[PDB]
């Protein structure tokens, strides 16, 4: 279960980082990268994560499917969104709210999507 | 684990958990059970009555195997046989009481603590007690002896 796995790895995981009175986790499907039961990307039956695309343009939204709860090769479905900012946020919001896929992660994923999208325009001096 | 002891927490403290005044000397008040009659008479008498002196007959070359006589109570009696053994005799219309050998199970004396289930049962033992023989005879069971 989600909680049972959480109590195992709440303080014993390779992704866990503890430094300067802070706690962070680096699993690939973690929004905000903090170590918490809510934001853990590997112990839940359904998770969603936002990552930059392979090139320096667009984002990749990855979700966990309901059948592959034990088969990591086909556990996740990935897609790449490379439209304008306002439209891109709408799709992520719609895939969370309308799909009702972990609705608490709505604003967290959008903020992470906002950070990634703004990280791809040319840097200023 | 060294890291879990008072020594790691008593660094910097001059007396190290033994007092500036009385300190931790080598052996105050004697070594071992010293002065069990003179200055530790109170502690020995308070916590260990009967400590000093001889009582009874000393017996040379005591062999514990001669006195070896394991006991068993009546409440634990039916645990020696299988579960199938008791129910089969319980449901049987014929008065076929099963045979139980506590010597086979490893007991020599059958004590009479508890109460027996209402069914006859034959007990073979080297020894019995008066109440154990009483209770067994009450439920239709008989007592026999072995050597």
């Amino acid at each position: 279960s989600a909680h049972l796995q959480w109590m195992v790895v709440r303080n014993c995981s390779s992704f866990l980082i503890k430094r300067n009175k802070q706690t962070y986790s680096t699993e690939p499907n973690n929004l905000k990268a903090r170590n918490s039961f809510r934001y853990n990307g590997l112990i839940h039956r359904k998770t969603v994560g936002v990552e930059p695309a392979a090139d320096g343009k667009g984002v990749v939204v990855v979700i966990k499917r309901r059948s592959g709860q034990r088969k990591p090769a086909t556990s996740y479905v990935r897609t790449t969104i490379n439209k304008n900012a306002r439209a891109t946020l709408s799709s992520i919001r719609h895939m969370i709210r309308k799909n009702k896929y972990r609705p608490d992660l709505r604003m967290a994923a959008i903020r992470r999507a906002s950070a990634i999208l703004r990280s791809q325009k040319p840097v200023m001096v | 684990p060294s890291r879990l002891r008072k020594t790691r927490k008593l660094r910097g403290h001059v007396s190290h958990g033994h007092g500036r005044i009385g300190k931790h000397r080598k052996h105050p008040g004697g070594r071992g059970n010293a002065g069990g009659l003179h200055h530790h008479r109170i502690n020995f008498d308070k916590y260990h009555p009967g400590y000093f002196g001889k009582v009874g007959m000393k017996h040379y070359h005591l062999k514990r195997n001669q006195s070896f006589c394991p006991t068993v109570n009546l409440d634990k009696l039916w645990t020696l046989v299988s579960e199938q053994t008791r129910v089969n005799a319980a449901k049987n219309k014929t008065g076929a009481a099963p045979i139980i050998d506590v010597v086979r199970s490893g007991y020599y004396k059958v004590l009479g603590k508890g109460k027996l289930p209402k069914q006859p049962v034959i007990v073979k033992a080297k020894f019995f007690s008066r109440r154990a023989e009483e209770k067994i005879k009450s439920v239709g069971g008989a007592c026999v002896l072995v050597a």
Binding site: H3, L4, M7, V8 | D45, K46, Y47, H48, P49, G50, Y51, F52, G53, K54, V55, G56, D75, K76, W78, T79, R86, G114, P117
Partner: protein, 187 residues
């Protein structure tokens, strides 16, 4: 300053299970929420007894539990014990028992199920009766440990029936002076 005495300010009581068992902590998490968000004091008694040590959660013999269940006015009630259920080989006719417990001996478990009983864990009991309705909250003998025989007054004092500490039992070990009038006294 004020005239108050600080030696009793910190109440010495358990707040969480000292054990690191995730399974125990998980059901503690469940009942901690249950105790906070309901009115039934049965949750709090169960919750605080989960914090207790093994010695404070003594095993419950099967014979003792059956005796309590057979008492009048307790029929069709779910027995609850926070600890280990222990089989007793001194009882034969096992009645149907709906019992919730933290741990049950396998031979105790097999006898109950063969007799038609029902076994539920504490999580299942929460789904059954969240308010603990229709439940009997039993416990094992807290003072049934051997250590309580030694506890009490000093053995040498008059009217003391406490077990002294001896490396062996025999006529040569702590029986002469102070135990019989033939040697000094008997007190």
């Amino acid at each position: 300053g004020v005239d108050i005495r600080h030696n009793k300010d910190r109440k010495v009581r358990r707040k969480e299970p000292k054990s690191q068992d995730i399974y125990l902590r998980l059901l503690v998490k469940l009942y901690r929420f249950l105790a906070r968000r309901t009115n039934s004091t049965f949750n709090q008694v169960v919750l605080k007894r989960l914090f207790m040590s093994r010695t404070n959660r003594p095993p419950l013999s099967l014979s003792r539990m059956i005796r309590k269940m057979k008492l009048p006015g307790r029929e069709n009630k779910t027995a609850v014990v926070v600890g280990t259920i222990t089989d007793d080989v001194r009882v034969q006719e096992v009645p149907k028992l709906k019992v919730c417990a933290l741990r049950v001996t396998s031979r105790a478990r097999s006898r109950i199920l063969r007799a038609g009983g029902k076994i539920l864990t504490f999580d299942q009991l929460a789904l059954d009766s969240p308010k603990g309705c229709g439940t009997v909250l039993l416990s094992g003998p807290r003072k049934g440990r051997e250590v309580y025989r030694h506890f009490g007054k000093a053995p040498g004092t008059p009217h003391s029936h406490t077990k002294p500490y001896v490396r062996s039992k025999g006529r040569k070990f702590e029986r002469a002076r102070g135990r019989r009038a033939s040697r000094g006294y008997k007190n």
